[PDB]
Structures are given as C-alpha cells and as structure tokens.
C-alpha cells in the first residue's frame, strides 16, 4: 500500500481517546475557573479558588538574562580578511528586531505546557537589491498545539533529521483569506476530523476550511560514494556500504566515475497522508533548504502515552483543605441559627408586628396556665449548633503553604556568586541555535560585490603574456587619492552556494557557556562589583590610554586609530583596518 | 535446545523477575503520580497525592559546578611548533556545546533509572567525508529504563571484563529503523524478548518485535609474539607466554624469524547471541574500537541483588500515613448527619418548603402527653462532635520537618571556596574521565598531516646526494616570497598509521583534573579575595608583562601575539621559531 500510505500512522495513543488528554490537559484549565468533575452537587458560588498562580510567577521573570548577548565570534582557521561584512551582521539587514519578546511568549507557555513552532514569512524580501544582508527569523505564537499528536523523534535536533512532518491547528484563521499570492485554483479539499468537544457543547466555529502544509516526511537522502559490480549495466542498485579501510584504487578491477553521481531521482512517494485527493508537486525553495524548525518539549515516558512532569499538580486536591472553609460557611451554613428565646412566648405565631421592629416597644406575649405535671423544670438552653471544632484543621493549610514556599527555593544564593542559572535556562537559552542558520550548512546567499562580476572576464587575464619586460612604476604613491591599480592574478577566492565539499566558510558561531566573552565584554565592569583589578604602570602607558574601552568602536570612538597610525611603528602597533593611507607628513 | 550454547547467560530470568522488576518500576512511579501497592479496600478520589518531590529539589542542587576547562598543557613529547599544524584539531574542538544540555534528563537517571545510555556515531565520520579534523563530544539518548537488568558480574563500570554486556531496545515504536543507512529492507530479524504482560489481560497496545544489537562471544585477542624452543614440533601452539628469560638471544639454538604472526581471526563462527537468526561478519581491524560508552552510576555490592544509592529518607510510613491521615478527615464530613438537636425539632411529617433554599421559618406545633408515667428533662444537644486531633501528628511532621532540615544539610558552604562536595561528584566526574575517547586518535588508517611525502617511498631522502659541493644557503636575496628553499633538508624517522608497538610519542592525554585548573588560575587569584601578590621596583621595570595577562586570545592583548616575543634584543630567546621576522636587530 505504498500509494495510499501514511494514514493512521498517528495511531499510537488514540484508541483510549475516551480518556486521552483529559488528565494531561488541565494545565490550560486549572490555570483558572473551576475544579470539580467526578462528584455530584458541587454548586452554588464557586470559581473563587484559583490562587495557585504566584508559585510560577517567579519562574517567568528570569527573562532579563535570557538574551545572553554574544555575536558571531570568528576563528583563526577561516579567513578573517573576509570579516569586512561580519561587523555589520546585526546591523545592515535586521537591526530593529521585536522578535526578542517572541521567545518569551514561548517561555511562559513552556512551563504551562509543551512548546511548539509556527509559520514563517520569507525573510528574503522587498526590492532595490543590496549587499549580503542575511539573518533569519521566527516568531512563536501562543499554543494551538493542544490536541496535536506527534510520534516521530521528539528529543533534540541539531542536524538534518526528519525534514517536516505534521502541522495542525484547530479553528485558527490567519492566512486563509490571504491565499492571493500563493496558488489560487479551487481549495475545496478540506479534510474531515472529529473536532474536540465533550458531549453537547457547541460554542466554537463549525466551519472547517482547514489548512495543513507538509514537505518531506520521515525519509532521508543517502549517497556515500557508490561503486558496484561492474558487469552488464547493473539495474536497480539499491545497495551501499561504507567500510573505508580496505582498498587503495580498484580502477583496473572495477568502477571509475571522475565525477559525482546523477540527479532527478523521482522522489519517494509521499501523498500528504491523505486518502482522498492531492496535487502537491515541486514546491521548492532554492535547494533542499527549508529554514523552519519545530520546538521540543520536556516530557518523560515509559508507556506509549507520555506523562507530564509538573509543579502545580502537586497540591491540587491536597489543598482542597481550603475548600473545607467553603464546605462549611458557603455550603452547610444552611443550618442557620434561627435563634429563638423560647421561654414564654405562648405559641410562637403572632401577628406580623413581631419581626418588623415597629416603634411600639412592649414585646409581652406571655400568660401561663400550663399542662399538668408539677414540681419540675425543663431547660431549652442549648439551642442550635456551633462552628466546627477548630483544631484539627490548623496544620493542613500550613503543610500546603510549606510545600508552596519550597518552590520559591531555586538556586538560592545570597546574591551573584555565579548566579541563578537553572535547568530551564540551559534548555531554554538559545532558539538562536535553532535559528543558528545563517547559511551555516546550507549556503546560498552571498555578497557578490557587483553580482560577483559573473565570472565573464576570465580570458582577458591572458593579454599580459607580452614578451618584452617586467617592471612597474616609480616610487609607489604620488597623486594617489582614489583606489586604482587592480590587476592581481587569476580568480582570488570563491563565491558560490556552500561550494559543497571545501569548507573555508565555517567560522563565526556562539560561545554559549560561561558568561565570559573572549574580548573585553566586562572590561570596565570591574568597578561595579568590589574593587582592585586592572593593573597599571609605566610599560602600559602605550595602549592603556587607548585600548581600555569597553564600548567597541563607534564613529566618534575612531580616536582609537589616531595614535596608532604612524609614529609608534617601532612598537608594532596593531596595524588596524584602514588600507589606504599608511603615511603621514 | 540444539547447540544453543552461551544463550543461558542472557536468558537469566525472563518471567520470575517479578520481585526485582516490580519495585524497579516502583521507585520511578512513586515519584510523580500514584502508589497502589498492597493493602485492601480502595476508595474514590486518589492519585493526586505525592509529597516525594521536595527532596528531589535537594538532589538537583548545585550539580553544574563542574566545567573544569583545560587548555594547551598536556605532557610535552615533541616540538610545540605543532601549534601551527596538528593543533587545528584542538582549534576546531571549541565548536561543540550542542547536546551537552541533553544531560539534564540523563543525570536525572542517576537516582532512579538504570545505566545511562550514550551512543555516538555508528561508523566513520558519517557525513562530509572530506578534511574535517574535529572532536569527540556527545549527544545522549533516552531509553534504558523499565526492562533492563544486567546479571553477570555487577562490580566494575570500566569493565575489565568482556566490555559491554548487553544492549536492549524495547517498548519503542519509532526506533525500528536506525538501519536504513545500508540495506533497509523490512521484516528480517524480529527478535522476541520479554513483554510487560503485567496482570490484567486486555493490553490495548500489542506492540512486539523487540530489537537488540551485539557482536561477539568469548572474544580472544592480542598481538601474540612469543619465544619457544620445545623441539617437540607440533601445531596448535597452546603456549601463550615466555615463562623465563628468552627475548635476549636465542640465536645459537634456532628460531630466526624477523616476522610477526599473520592473523586472520579464528574465534568462532557463532558470534554473540543466537536465538534463531544471525547477523554480520567481515569487519574488525586492530581491536578496541567501542567508542560508544554509556554513562554509569554508583553501586557498591553486598550480596546478590544489590541496592545502589538510596533514593529518599523515610518515605514509606510517614508519607503513606500522610495518605492515611486522609483515611478519615473529609471522609467523615459526608458522615456529618446534619446533626440536629432532638425532642421535636423532628420535621419528618410536614411541609418541606423550608428546605427549598429560602428559609420560611419556624416549626410551631409541639405538644406532649403519655399514660400515667412521670418524666424528666433532657439535654438535646450534647454529643461528641470532637474528633481524634493530630496533636501528636503536628510535631511528628514538624520533627520530621527537622529531619528534612537534616537532609537539607549537605556539603556545608557559605561562599567562595568550601563547596557542597559529596561522592556523587567523583562518580560522575569518574564517568567524564574515561571520556577522552578519540581526543588523540582512533586507530584504523591514516589521519595524518603529511606522511613521507605523498605516499611516495623513494625520493624524499634523496635530495642531499647531489655531486660536487653541497653547501649551506648563501648569496644575498631581496624578496624571498615563500621561504623553505631546500638544499640540505631531509626526512627521517617514520610516518605511518597505528604506530605499531610504540605509544607515547605524542603530547596528548587527559589533561583535566581537580576543582582548580580552569583557564588560568595559576597567575590569577585576586577577585576571590584581597587583591595582588606582587610588589613594585626600580630594577623590576620589566614587571610581570610576561605574566599578568589573563586568558587565551583577547582584543586588548594584541601586543603579545607578536611584538612581545619580538623585542628581546641583547638576549633574543623567546620560544624561538624565527623563520622570517627580524634580521639586524
């Protein structure tokens, strides 16, 4: 069934769906509103309970340190001379960026429930083409992952992995009426599902017009240097091994290629997991590049239904001990006192004057000639009831509240001293490394100064073979001024998309780890905490006046370059960026 | 049972593991969700009661204190100038933080679950089979949990024994195919292992077809070069060692070989464990090569079934009576019979509209008489509504709260030094010491800078044989372009793979160590407490400029990268290279 496949492949947990996420879904429920499900006659005035919130309100507020500022530390093994563009990465493309808060939108729902990922609009945009200018983006939305069921891998993904599998949302709107610029043929497809509801409740939208987007699903690509069985053409290979150690060169006894193998494999059938209809051909961006990534979740499991591990569910029924004040004064208070002083109001039923409190004072109802017993009293004194034995209820609430002040203890310090980093920071630190992509493996976009010259001038290079003599002008500069004398040699460096095998392009990436950043991030921050760091003395009178800035270099900070231009050469300077001048007089 | 052989080792107890399996899943389940164990008479609303959590917050604590970075200082066996050649390995080493974070749940395995599983790449280099020269680091995996039990030895983790005993992957679905890299066709192996048949029959999930990966039985290997002169002349040597002094000179007796042994592996054609099928052959080179090394916990051994690190405290009675203080507390609230004063409050016969939620007030008809009797007054209200009050339980849970204060005492610490050190430290760091792994080399064939001049066996030593005069370099020159003009230079020693018998010709082994190594501590103390170690002086005007600099490469230090080694004038010796820079200084 290769053609109709990928239906029911989600079959893992759905047989018990009568129960399903009922136990696991309450994080979006218990967050507010109401408690009872099982029992009967939980009624009257309810919905005040809540009050569990603040425990996690400390866990949301760490966002201040979430940035962890670090920018593209180069290496010395790549070419730093190509760094001219690097200094503008955060600048010349995306500069004012709101999405830094969009990380946090995921940060809360994280501890609230699983954290997903959502749709993208291509960052390759607009008009008036320009220089290199690449950085990618993703903006997390709120939830709509609720009944989404995934079985694929769901641990951690650094590299290629599964491409893209399943995206489903129930009763969103978004890009529906925005179809204008994509395809626009019919779009009446709209699969049928059982929409989440329990019993009668029809409050939601019963319109469907659903949308789902898939690419390539749970299969990968492998090549790995194929050489095989050299007789009679070898139909249907369907084989490979690795085992690198054996051979030297088999050319006389075997295969020769002198190239890489060929392309346009009809790509393995997929069908978008549907039994009805489809078209779905050649939706493709550049190469196989697809810069959209799903986000993980923190769930342990043994049985095929992954059970949460959570905080607020600890004390749920444990602190129903609070509702026992609600089970008395709000419920069984119906025992209401109805206090009657009973001694000599004859029979209790008089005219309405009694409880209306009119200005006529005398309350006398009483006259006595009573039943015949004689020489004996009767004592009504006790009357009705009381509040309930106020002892045994004391420690219950105290234990609940104690377990609550436990969750306020996390990485507790006096202050500072290698501060409060915790598990949730280590796991939540970078979606920048889920956004790690800047052509990091898939290389496409490049500077190409003016369209990289489009490599049409090569032949001209050979005009200079003229036999006569080799020499050039007199002393180097005279009128110099504008840049001139471009001759050099055959092609200097490479401009392409990833250039496949040869890697000189991998350098600048994140230092994540301790807060230490290699060059002088804290340089003058020494003074805020304690004192007594930076040495000083005469031999440092060279660069301590200059290079002691923590501010990097601005255009008014260019004074860094005034004293090192010329005179101090005998000490070696740094020989800074500026190519042209190297002279003063 | 035909030639089943070693299988009796790994079958062990598939069924009768009831006792040691049941608790084995117990300590994991009793944390988060429910405990239903032994006693009879279950009741209604249950499963929300945990109170095993706080101590685990005691257990996570400070665990991350152990980066212990180390750089550049192994045991020096050769010239340090390799900084420009091989050390690019170490210079791309820094790329990897990556899946370290994944240990968050992997170290959570220490207190409950079994052997922490760590499996690195299946074969050589995986993707990008080109110049790479990179390092060893880790990407943990989830599953060894419920059914894993190892019964053979149960002593030492470094395993001076057969190395890895057993590999078990079970109760997973997505984990069918890690094997798609090579042949990939379905429905071959289908091994059948024990199943979680628990007690009740239905088992809504039928999943079967467990898989396990494994190789050798009674593996016998070493190099085996020996001396013998029994002059009994038989094959199948059956003597493995030199019992007396031999190697020195046997010449007069005989035994002139100048060769090692030529080994095609003998072993046995039944490899590892066979129920029905068989797997693979034609692989090995040169022994060792098990780069996947799962991470282990701490176990001392007493007798037979061993209890490793105890989890938490007293839990069994204290917390199950926290659940048995729930025996009757709110359960007697339903046993409150709207306790009514008696002697004609009794309303049974009447108009019930008093109970409608609005009051509508008193019951006015009371009158009495009997035959000739005599009677006495009664006390209507007096009874026992007073319960059994947790007077004792208050200081039972508060004194037990002082016990939880006692488990809050670990590794007494204030600030700065004097941390929380315990044995768990040294066991996990013990797991990280054996993790050197591939830092140096992994022995198959060439990973090499330059080997004897491009595989050519002839001319690299042939340059100095030119007739007439062979003289040192002379005669002026202006611009030398690339240096290393060759006259008397030659090659010697050896360039090959595996190094044969000799080890220890190279610099690198594990350089990590105690709490104090880091980047540079030795010259940096200071910010810990109370400033500097060094005075100032007139002859001292050199003054530590070779020392006080702190960390690796930094932007402020650029004077050191070159000119601080360039200036020594009258002496002129700093870690000398001097191919180029200075002439007449």
Swiss-Prot record, chains A, B:
GO BP term, pick one: viral DNA genome packaging
Keywords: Capsid protein, Late protein, Viral capsid assembly, Viral genome ejection through host cell envelope, Viral genome packaging, Viral penetration into host cytoplasm, Viral release from host cell, Viral short tail ejection system, Virion, Virus entry into host cell
Top-level taxon of origin: Viruses
Annotated GO CC locations: viral portal complex
Entry's localization field: Virion
Presence of keyword Nucleotide-binding: no
Membrane-spanning intervals of the chain: none
Location, primary (coarse class): virion
Record flagged with keyword Lyase: no
Variant or mutagenesis effect after changing residue 56 to A/T/M: Overpackaging
Function: Forms the portal vertex of the capsid. This portal plays critical roles in head assembly, genome packaging, neck/tail attachment, and genome ejection. Procapsid assembly may initiate with a nucleation complex composed of portal and scaffolding proteins. The portal protein multimerizes as a single ring-shaped homododecamer arranged around a central channel. Switches upon genome packaging from an asymmetrical conformation in the procapsid (PC-portal) to a symmetrical ring in the mature capsid (MV-portal). This change of conformation may serve as a signal for headful packaging.
Quaternary state and interactors: Homododecamer. Interacts with the terminase large subunit; this interaction allows the packaging of viral DNA. Interacts (via C-terminus) with the head-to-tail adapter protein gp4; this interaction participates in the head completion. Interacts with the scaffolding protein; this interaction initiates procapsid assembly, thereby ensuring incorporation of only one portal ring per capsid. Interacts with the capsid protein.
Family: Belongs to the p22likevirus portal protein family.
Protein name: Portal protein
Taxonomic source organism: Salmonella phage P22
Organismal lineage: Viruses, Duplodnaviria, Heunggongvirae, Uroviricota, Caudoviricetes
Gene designation per UniProt: 1
Residues included from the entire protein: 9 to 593 of 725
């Amino acid at each position: 069934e290769s053609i109709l496949s990928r239906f029911d492949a989600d079959w893992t947990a759905s047989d018990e769906a009568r129960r399903e996420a009922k136990n696991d879904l309450f994080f979006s429920r218990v967050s507010q509103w109401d408690d009872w499900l099982s029992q009967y006659t939980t009624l009257q005035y309810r919905g005040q309970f809540d009050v569990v919130r603040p425990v996690v309100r400390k866990l949301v507020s760490e966002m201040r340190q979430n940035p962890i500022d670090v920018l593209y530390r180069p290496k010395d093994g790549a070419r730093p001379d190509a760094a001219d563009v690097l200094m503008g990465m955060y600048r010349t493309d995306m500069r004012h960026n709101t999405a830094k808060i969009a990380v946090n939108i995921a940060v809360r729902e994280q501890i609230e429930a699983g954290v997903g990922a959502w749709r993208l609009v291509t960052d390759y945009e607009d008009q008036s083409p320009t220089s290199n200018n690449q950085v990618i983006r993703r903006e997390p939305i709120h939830s709509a992952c609720s009944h989404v069921i995934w079985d694929s891998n769901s641990k951690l993904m650094d590299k290629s992995d599964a491409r893209h599998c399943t995206v489903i949302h129930s009763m969103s709107q978004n890009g529906w009426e925005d179809f204008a610029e994509k395809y626009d043929l019919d779009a009446d497809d709209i699969p049928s599902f059982q929409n989440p509801n329990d019993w009668v409740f029809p409050w939601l939208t019963q319109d469907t017009i659903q949308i789902a987007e898939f690419y390539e699903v749970v299969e990968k690509k492998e090549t790995a240097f194929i050489y095989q069985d050299p007789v009679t053409g070898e139909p249907v290979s369907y084989f490979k091994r690795d085992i690198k150690d054996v051979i030297d060169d088999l050319a006389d006894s075997g295969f020769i290629k002198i190239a890489e193998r060929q392309i346009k494999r009809r790509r393995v059938y997929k069908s978008i997991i549907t039994c009805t209809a489809v078209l779905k051909d050649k939706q493709l961006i550049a190469g196989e590049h697809i810069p959209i990534v799903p986000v993980f979740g923190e769930w342990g499991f043994v049985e095929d239904k992954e059970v949460y591990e959570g905080v607020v569910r600890l004390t749920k029924d444990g602190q129903r001990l609070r509702n026992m004040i609600m089970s008395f004064n709000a419920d069984i208070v119906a025992r209401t006192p109805k206090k009657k002083p009973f001694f000599w109001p004859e029979q209790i039923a008089g005219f309405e004057h009694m409880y209306d409190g009119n200005d006529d004072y005398p309350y006398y109802l009483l006259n006595r000639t009573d039943e015949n017993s004689g020489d004996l009293p009767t004592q009504p004194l006790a009357y009705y009831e009381n509040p309930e034995v106020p002892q045994a209820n004391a420690y219950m609430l105290e234990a609940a509240t104690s377990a609550v002040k436990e969750v306020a203890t996390l990485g507790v310090d006096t202050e500072a001293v290698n501060g409060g980093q915790v598990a949730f920071d280590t796991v939540n630190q970078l979606n920048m490394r889920a956004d790690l992509e800047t052509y990091v493996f898939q290389d496409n976009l490049a500077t190409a100064m003016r369209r990289d010259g489009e490599i049409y001038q090569s032949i001209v290079n050979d005009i200079y073979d003229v036999p006569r003599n080799v020499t050039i002008t007199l002393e180097d500069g005279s009128e110099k001024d504008v840049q001139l004398m471009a001759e050099v040699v055959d092609l200097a460096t490479g401009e392409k998309q990833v250039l496949n095998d040869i890697r000189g392009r991998y350098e600048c990436y994140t230092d994540v780890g301790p807060s230490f950043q290699s060059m002088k991030q804290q340089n003058r921050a020494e003074i805020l905490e304690l004192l007594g760091k930076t040495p000083q003395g005469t031999p440092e009178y060279q660069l301590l006046l200059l290079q002691y800035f923590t501010l990097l270099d601005g255009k008014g900070v260019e004074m860094m370059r005034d004293y090192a231009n010329k005179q101090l050469i005998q000490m070696g300077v740094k020989k800074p960026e500026t190519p042209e001048e190297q002279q003063w007089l």
